[PDB]
């Protein structure tokens, strides 16, 4: 079934964080607003509603989340560890890091900006989008990436983690170090 | 060897200490409506795990929070009350914490006996050759 | 090493996130009373063989003194 207004109230804390862990909810109403953090870990939710607003961070670790629609506003970070997300939509306003470890993610939006750290660890992604900007640490360990785009920006450390990079960006300014 | 018993039993001594501290924080936060970190505390549990990697030490793999819904109480005049007027309190269950308190103490003390038992065997093994 | 054939100890706890459909968490089939007895039996039997091995060396040492 689907979450109602009264069922929403029974999964909210004092400061306004929605906890849906292991709960049997399949879809959320459109134009959904959360006062604080949102947790949809281990949920059978396969799609996030259009116009979704989260006043905190989105937690979807080891969930069945697959599709996020554009226009979603997230003030905190996005944690989609172990979910079933295959692509990242364009135009997501993310106020924090993006953790996509152990996901079937294949494609990323062009010129994506991550205000925090980025993770593509053990993902089947084949190539990073052109003009990528990362303000934190980039972990690509165990992924299928082997060629970086012509231009990219990482303001922290770059962790190869084991994968072999052969074509480095022509224009790259690094605020940290590169680790294998 | 008999020294591996000390590593295995010693790991359980630390393991049961983690669960005791987690229970202590649960008992002390059973009536705390507010919390720094913008999160209404929820009951935490230490999930043990055998690290097979003969001798199988026990390791704490991380603390996990309770899945029970928070206890909602209608307190309309509280500053933390929502529009409907309900304030939410942690889902700490007193009875399970008391049961965890007993089990953690009983398991902690029986690991001391095994370490003591292995100590005597090593001392006798050293008396051979003298 | 062989695992025991005793059925796992089932506990009703629809709160642990690692539970199942019926709210059951299965726990190891370890019996404390049989572990205490094994601890007593293992320690005593281990130290008994220390005495036999230690006394065996004495017999070997006395053999070297034959004819002296």
């Amino acid at each position: 079934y689907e979450l109602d207004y009264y069922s929403k109230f029974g999964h909210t804390d004092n400061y306004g964080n929605l906890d849906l862990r292991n709960k049997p909810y399949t879809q959320l109403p459109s134009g959904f607003v959360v006062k604080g953090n949102l947790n949809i870990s281990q949920t059978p939710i396969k799609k996030l509603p259009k116009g979704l607003d989260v006043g905190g961070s989105l937690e979807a670790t080891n969930s069945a989340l697959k599709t996020i629609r554009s226009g979603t506003k997230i003030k905190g970070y996005a944690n989609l560890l172990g979910s079933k997300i295959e692509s990242w939509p364009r135009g997501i306003k993310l106020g924090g890091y993006l953790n996509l470890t152990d996901t079937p993610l294949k494609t990323l939006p062009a010129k994506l900006r991550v205000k925090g750290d980025l993770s593509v660890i053990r993902t089947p992604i084949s190539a990073l989008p052109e003009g990528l900007v990362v303000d934190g640490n980039l972990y690509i360990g165990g992924s299928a990436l082997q060629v970086f785009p012509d231009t990219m920006t990482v303001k922290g450390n770059i962790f190869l983690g084991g994968n072999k990079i052969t074509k480095w960006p022509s224009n790259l300014t690094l605020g940290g170090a590169v680790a294998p | 060897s008999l020294f591996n018993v000390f590593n295995v039993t010693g790991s359980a001594m630390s393991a049961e200490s983690v669960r005791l501290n987690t229970t202590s924080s649960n008992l002390a936060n059973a009536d705390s409506v507010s919390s720094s970190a913008k999160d209404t505390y929820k009951a935490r549990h230490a999930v043990f795990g055998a690290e097979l990697s003969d001798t199988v030490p026990v390791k704490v793999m991380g603390i996990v929070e309770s899945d029970k819904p928070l206890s909602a109480e209608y307190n309309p005049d509280h500053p933390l009350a929502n529009e409907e007027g309900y304030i939410y309190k942690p889902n700490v269950n007193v009875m399970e914490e008391m049961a965890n308190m007993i089990s953690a103490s009983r398991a902690y003390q029986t690991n001391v006996q095994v370490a003591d038992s292995s100590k005597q065997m090593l001392l006798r093994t050293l008396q051979m050759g003298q | 090493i062989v695992e025991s054939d005793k059925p796992l100890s089932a506990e009703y706890n629809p709160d642990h996130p690692l539970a199942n459909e019926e709210g059951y968490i299965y726990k190891p089939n370890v019996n404390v009373m049989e572990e205490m007895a094994n601890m007593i039996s293992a320690s005593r039997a281990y130290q008994t063989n220390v005495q036999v091995a230690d006394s065996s060396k004495q017999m070997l040492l006395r053999t070297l003194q034959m004819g002296q």
């Binding site: 281990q42 924090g96 470890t101 750290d117 303000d135 | 999930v47 991380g62 603390i63 | 996130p17």
Partner: peptide, 24 residues
């Protein structure tokens, strides 16, 4: 890995991925 919902002891920062927990 192991448990899927372990916590993190580091203070919230919302910008750095917590490496305290086994994030795999």
């Amino acid at each position: 890995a192991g448990i899927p919902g372990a916590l993190s002891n580091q203070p919230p920062a919302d910008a750095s991925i917590p490496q305290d927990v086994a994030q795999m």
